[PDB]
Amino acid sequence: DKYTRARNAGGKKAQDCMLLAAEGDSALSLLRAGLTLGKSNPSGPSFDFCGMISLGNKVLQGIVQVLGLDFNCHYKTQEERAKLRYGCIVACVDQDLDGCGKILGLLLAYFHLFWPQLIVHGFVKRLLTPLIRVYEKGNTVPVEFYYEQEFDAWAKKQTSLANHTVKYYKGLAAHDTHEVKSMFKHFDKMVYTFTLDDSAKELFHIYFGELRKRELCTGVVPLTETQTQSIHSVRRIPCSLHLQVDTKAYKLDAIERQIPNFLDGMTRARRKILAGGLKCFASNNRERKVFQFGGYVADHMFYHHGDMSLNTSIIKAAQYYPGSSHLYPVFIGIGSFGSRHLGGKDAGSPRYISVQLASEFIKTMFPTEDSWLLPYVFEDGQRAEPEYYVPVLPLAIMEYGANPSEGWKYTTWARQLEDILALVRAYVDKNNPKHELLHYAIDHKITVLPLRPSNYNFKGHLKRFGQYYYSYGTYVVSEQRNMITITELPLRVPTVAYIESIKKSSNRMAFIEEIVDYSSSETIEILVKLKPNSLSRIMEEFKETEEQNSIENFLRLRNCLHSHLNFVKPKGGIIEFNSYYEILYAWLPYRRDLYQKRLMRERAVLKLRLIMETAIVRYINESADLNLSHYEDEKEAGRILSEHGFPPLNQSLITSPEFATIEELNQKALQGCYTYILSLQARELLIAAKTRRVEKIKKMQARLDKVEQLLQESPFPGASVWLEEIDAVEKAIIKGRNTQWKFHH
Amino acid sequence: DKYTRARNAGGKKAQDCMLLAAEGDSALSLLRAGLTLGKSNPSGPSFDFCGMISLGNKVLQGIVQVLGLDFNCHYKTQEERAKLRYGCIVACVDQDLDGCGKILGLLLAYFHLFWPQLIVHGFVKRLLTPLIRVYEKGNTVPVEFYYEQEFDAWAKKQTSLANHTVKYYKGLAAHDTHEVKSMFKHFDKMVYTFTLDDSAKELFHIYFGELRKRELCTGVVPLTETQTQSIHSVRRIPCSLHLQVDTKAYKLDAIERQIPNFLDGMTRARRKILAGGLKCFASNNRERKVFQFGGYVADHMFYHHGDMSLNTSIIKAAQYYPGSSHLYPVFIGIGSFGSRHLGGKDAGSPRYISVQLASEFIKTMFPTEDSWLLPYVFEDGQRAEPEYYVPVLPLAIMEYGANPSEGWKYTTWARQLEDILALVRAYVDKNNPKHELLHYAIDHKITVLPLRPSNYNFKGHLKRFGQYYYSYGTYVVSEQRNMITITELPLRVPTVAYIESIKKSSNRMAFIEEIVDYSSSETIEILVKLKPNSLSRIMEEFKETEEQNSIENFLRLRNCLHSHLNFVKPKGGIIEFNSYYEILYAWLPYRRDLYQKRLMRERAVLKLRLIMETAIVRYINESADLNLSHYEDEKEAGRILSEHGFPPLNQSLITSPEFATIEELNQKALQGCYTYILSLQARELLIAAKTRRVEKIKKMQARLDKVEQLLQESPFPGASVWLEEIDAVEKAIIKGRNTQWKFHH
C-alpha cells in the first residue's frame, strides 16, 4: 500500500516516530531521498523514527489501519494517544491550491470529524517547505520566504533585483537535490503543528459540508504579516487560517475556471488564450495550426492544464455558426470547426484546422494601447494574462454562455447589439437627449432603455411571457404527404441532440414513422414523416395554451431563455447579478477610468518621445561636424554629447513604453544614457529620414495638444475617443457579420 | 447509426446512388455542407443520389446492413450487383496517413477478403481531395496538386515562390468553406474508382495476415510521375499501388514512433524534443518548466501528438539515475524527475519540474554548426526536426533503450564508454597502433577491439556465459539474525517491480517472513526477514550449478541482457544488426561525410564573410570623406557606393548562413544589396569598433587558412577536428558524471 515501515514504529518509541503522508510518488521519492541522507546528514531524520505513506476512500482506511486509530475513541487522554503507533502524522504536500489547499483541508476535515482531540493535541502536523527562494549571484545560500507577503515586503526593502534570481516552489517536486539536502538539514524547523480554533469548528462544516456560497462571495484575503510572524514564532498553524486561505483560494480558482468575469465575460483559461492570440498575431497575422497555437499559449502564458482542454477552448473561441457560444469570435477559424449540429463538438483535429486573429475586430474591441494599463496576474513571478479585460462594449452580455458549477450556474443569452450600442452612446455622448436621464437612471437604479435578447442568426420567434423570454422554431406541415419539415430549431439547440431527444420519448413515436436530417451547414431542414392520419391524434393528444402550439409542443419547438448572471469580481470573489442593465452600469466605470488612464500615460510618453526625437534630429543636423569616427570609444562619445547639451535618455523605456506606469516613466526615462544617438542607423543620416522624423515630430506635437484638449473633455476625459472606438467596433462587427465572420474577403 | 439515408437509396435508381463513407464527424459535417449547397451548386451532388455513413466489427455490420450486402453471394454477375442498395461506395478519408492507410486500407482489405468481385467491378471508390493548394497573390483561383511529387515538379518548373502561398491539406477538416464549395462543384472529377490487381492479392495478405517483416525491411517508394498521370487520366487507382505507397507508409511511421534510428538512437518524438531544446535554449539557457518547453516544441518543432506523451518523453530525456534510459541525458532537470524505483515513472508534475539544455555536453556532442547540414523533415511545408542527427559518438549503443514493438522488438544495453572511445579514436587518429587493422576489419566485418557492456552506475557483476551476458546484484546475508540485505539489484530492474515479482511467487514467500524496502535514492537496501531455519531450505531448493548461487536464484538477482538490435534506416525501412560494432561501422561514414560537408560550407562562408567585412572596414575608413547626410535617399546612396567600388552583398545570407547548400549561397551571392553599409549603427564607427573589426578580419583569415589546410587531411578531411570534438565530448561526459549530470552545481 505504498507504505514504508519505520524501525521504531509500533514499538516502545512510538511517540517519537513520525508518519510522513505525501501526495504522489514524486513526493514519496523526495521524502525517501531526504530521509536516506545517512551520515551525510547527522542527527537528521531517517527511517529509524520516520515512516512514509502516500495519499494518492480506501487510502484513509489504510492510514487508519497503519496508524492503529479506531473509530470508537476520542484520544482526549494521554494514554489513548500513547497507544497509537506513531507520535504524529506529518502531511508532506505541495504549496499550490490543489496540493496544499485541497488535500490538506480534506485530511484536516477528516481528522476533525473523527478525532478532533488529535488536532487539539497537535497530533496532525504539516511540512512547510520554503515557497520563494531568492539567490544572490556569487552566493550559495538563498533567502527563503514561506509566503508571498514576506517576499514582497523584502523586495520593497531591497533597492534592485537585477543581482537576484527569484525561484518559486509551488510543488514538492520543484526542489533540487541540494535544496532538499538544505531543507532536511533543518527538518525539525519545517514541521508546523495544527491547532483547532473556535471559528474552525464552523469553518470545517462550511468548506466541507449552502452558506459556503455566501462565504465564497468575497475574495481571498492574504494573511497579514502579524499572523505569519505569530505562526513562525511558535510553529503552530491555526486550521481556521488555513481553511480561510488555501481552501478558499482553491475553491475560487475552480469557480474562475468555470465561471467567467463580468468585465469581459470570459474566464482565466480563455483570458490566457486571448492574450496569447494578441501577443502571437500582433507582429504577423498568419494562419497557425490549433495545436501550434495551443503550444504557444502554454509556453508563453503559463497554461499548465491539459492540452486537450486548451485546444477545445481555442476551437470554441474560433467557432462561428448559428447558435454558437460566441457571437463575435476573437479568432477567424480556417477549416471546419463544426456547426450547429452536435453543438460544435464535430470540429476537426487540432493539427488540421488553423486559426488566426480577427485583427480588425480585436483591434477595435480590445485596444492595443489599453492592454498596458490593465492589472496583470503573475505566475511564479512571470507575467501572465491580465487580471481582467475592459472591452469597449460590455462583452459579458453580448455573447451566449452556458456552464455548470459547484452549486452555481452560468447562463447568459446575448442582448441585442443595437440596444447595447444605443445605451453606451447615450451614456458617453453628452449630446444624445437621453444622456442626463441615463445618468439619473444609473445613480438611482432604474432602467430607461430596453435590452432585448439578440436574434441575429436566429430565424424563429422571440416572445416574452411575464418576465421570461421564449424562442420558437419554425415548421411547415404538408398533410398531402403527411409529413413535417422543421425549418428552424429553438435557439442554442444542437440538431442531432434535438433529434435524439425526440427519438428518446417513445410517446411521440406513437405517430412518427421516420426522421431524416437534410439540414445544411447553416440552416435547419429536418424531414419528419408520420404514420397515416396522425394529424388528428396529434391534435387531440396535445392541448397547449396561447404560448405554444400542438405541433410546437409535440416537436418541443420552444426554449426558455433562463438567465443566471453569476460572475467573478475583478478583485476576487463572485457577484450574482439579476439583470443585464446593472451589469452594463457596473462595467462602465472601469472603461471610463481606464480611458483617462491611457490619456495621461499617452501624454507622458508623448512628451518623452518628443524630447528624444528633437534631440535625435538635432544630432542628425549636427552630425557633419560631430563625426564619431575620429573619436575612440563609447564613453568619450557620451561625454562629448553631454558637453554639447544632449540629454541622456532611457530610450529603451520610452521607445518601448511597457506596463511601467507614469511615475516609473518620469523617474526612469531621464535616468538613461546616450545609446539612442549611438544606435542610430546610417540610413537615418540622409536628409529623407530627417524629413520623415520632423514631419512625424509635428504629428506627435499635434497629437500632444489634442490629448491636452481631450483630457478636459466634459462628460469625462476621452468621451470623444470612446465614441470613435464605439463607431469603429460597430463597423468591424458589421463587416464581420456581412462576411460570416470571415474577414479579408 | 450516424447514417443519413439518401432519397433514392434502396429504390429503382439505387445504381445511381452513392454512399460517402467519412472517417470522423468533422468529415461527415464537411460532406453534409458540400452536399447541401442546393441551388448555389446546380447539377451537383445532393442527398437525392448520395447518402452519408460514418466509419469511425460493429461499424462494418452497419455498413453491410445499410448496403444490403450478403456474405454468401459473390456479386460476380451484373444482376447480383444490381440488387445492392447503392451503386458504389466512396471512402471520404483524410489525405494524411492515419486516415487512408489505417482506415481506407482496412476497408479495402475487408472488401477484398469478403467481396473481391465488387472491387474488381469498381464498386469501391474513394474521394481524392487536393493535397496541396498554391495561391497566387492577388488571384482568387489557386492551383491544386493531388500528390506531393507533382507539386515538387511544378515547383522546379517555377522560378520564385515569393508571390505564391502554399497550403497543405492533409485532412478533410483543413478545407475552407469556399474551397469545399469549389471542390463540390466538380465533385464528379474527385471520385476515383479502385481496380483489383493479381499482385494486390499478395499484398493484402502481406499487410493483413509474417511477410510483413521482410516487406517493411525497405523504405516506402513514392509513386512515379507516369503512374500518377495514368491514375489521373483514367481516374482509376490500383489496390496494389495504394497498399505499396500509402499503407506501407502508415505502418513504417507507426513503427518509427517506437524503434529509433541507429544514427542517433532517438525516435521522431525524441529527435523533435532535442531539436526544440537546441532551438530554445540556444540564445538563453534559462530554466524552463516542462509544460512550457513542451508547448515550445509543439509550436516550433511541429509535435502534433498529445502533450502527455511529449511531457513523458521530455522527462525521460531529463532523467538521470542508475538504470535510467539515458546515460547521457540531453536536459539537466531541476526538480524531482524520478529515481531507480517505479521504473523512473515517479517524476514530478510537468508544471513544477523544470528543464534546461545541458549546453556543456550537448553543444559538443551535437555540434551547432553541423545541424545546418542535416536533411530536415518538412511538415506541411514547414521545417521540423532533422531526419537524423549525426553525433560525434554513436549514441544508439552508449545508452540503454528498451521498448515493446509491433512486429519487432527493440532492446539495447549501453556499451562501455572507454571501449567506444578507443574504437573511434583508433578509426580516426591515423596514428593509433590499432588504426590499420581496424580499417581492415571494417571492410572484413570482424572484431579487433573489445566492446563490453557498460557498468558505470552498476555495482553488481557482469558475467558472460556462452554468448549471453548476465547482471548480478550484490547481497549480504547475516545468519546471526537470519536476514538477507539486497545491496544492489540487477541492471535496469525497478525496485518496486522487483519486490512485487518476489512477492507474487508463493514458493519464495513460503520461506520469507517479510520484505521491507529501505533503499536510498540511488542505493538499493532491501531488507528481507526470513522464517526460522529457512537457510537450509534455500540451500537445497533453489540451488544452481554455476550460473547462479542458490541465494541469487531464490532472490532472482540474475538478469539476462538480451539485445534485439533492430533500428530504423535513415532512408526508411528497418535494418537488423547482430552486434554493436556493425552499428558503429554503419555510423562512421555518415559522421565523416558530415565533417567534410561542414569543412566545405565553412570555407565558403568564411570567404563570403571576409569579403563582406573587408567592404565594411573600407567603408568605415572612408566614412569621413563620404558623408551620407548630404545624399538624398538609399537608392542614390547605393548608386554612389557602387560608383566608389563597394560591391552589393546579401547581408542576410552571409550574416545568417541558414540551412542552405553550398550552391544556394554560391548562386545567391550574385544578387546583392547595400544594406550592410547602411544598416551598421553609429557606434560601429568608433575607433575601438574598427580595430575589433580588423582583428576579427585577421582572425577569420587565419581560420580560413586553417580550414583550407584541414580539408587536405590524411585519414579523411577533418580527422583532427573529429579527434578534438571526441576529446571535448569525453571531457564533458566526465564532468557530468562527476557532478551527477548537474553541470555547474
Numbering used by the authors:
A (entry chain B), B (entry chain A): 416 to 471, 502 to 654, 658 to 1193
Source paper text:
To capture the intact structure of full-length pP1192R, the protein sample was then analyzed by single-particle cryo-EM. After collecting and processing 2134 cryo-EM images, two types of particles, referred to as State 1 and State 2, were identified and reconstructed to the overall resolution of 2.77 and 2.98 Å with 131 161 and 78 195 particles, respectively. The electron density was only observable for the DNA binding/cleavage domain in both states, while the electron density of the N-terminal ATPase domain was absent. Following the process of atomic model building based on the EM density map, the apo structure of the pP1192R DNA binding/cleavage domain was well resolved in both states, with the C-terminus of the protein (C-gate) adopting distinct conformations, accordingly described as ‘open’ (State 1) and ‘closed’ (State 2). These apo structures can be traced for 779 residues, ranging from D416 to H1192, except for the region containing residues G471-N501. In the closed state, an extra dimeric interface, the C-gate, was formed by the interaction between the coiled-coil helices of two protomers, which retains a distance of ∼16 Å in the open state. No significant conformational changes were observed in the DNA-binding groove when comparing the two apo states, while the coiled-coil helices underwent a distinct conformational rearrangement, presenting the dynamic cycling of the C-gate between open to closed. The coiled-coil regions (from A' α14 to A' α18) of each protomer move towards one another in the closed state, with the furthest end moving a distance of ∼13.4 Å and a reorientation of ∼12° relative to the open state. Comparison of the m-AMSA-poisoned DNA-binding/cleavage domain with the apo structure (the C-gate closed state) revealed relative conformational reorientations of the DNA-contacting region of the two protomers.
The African swine fever virus (ASFV) type II topoisomerase (Topo II), pP1192R, is the only known Topo II expressed by mammalian viruses and is essential for ASFV replication in the host cytoplasm. In ASFV, a functional viral Topo II pP1192R has been identified, encoded by a viral gene conserved in ASFV strains, P1192R. pP1192R is detectable at an intermediate to late stage of ASFV infection, mainly within the cytoplasmic virus factory, and has been confirmed to be important for ASFV replication. Topo IIAs exhibit a 2-fold symmetry and comprise two functional domains: an ATPase domain and a DNA binding/cleavage domain. The mechanism of enzymatic action involves the opening and closing of three gate-like dimeric interfaces, which are called the N-, DNA- and C-gate, respectively, upon ATP binding and hydrolysis and DNA cleavage that introduces a double-strand break in the DNA (G-segment) trapped in the DNA-gate for transport of another DNA strand (T-segment).
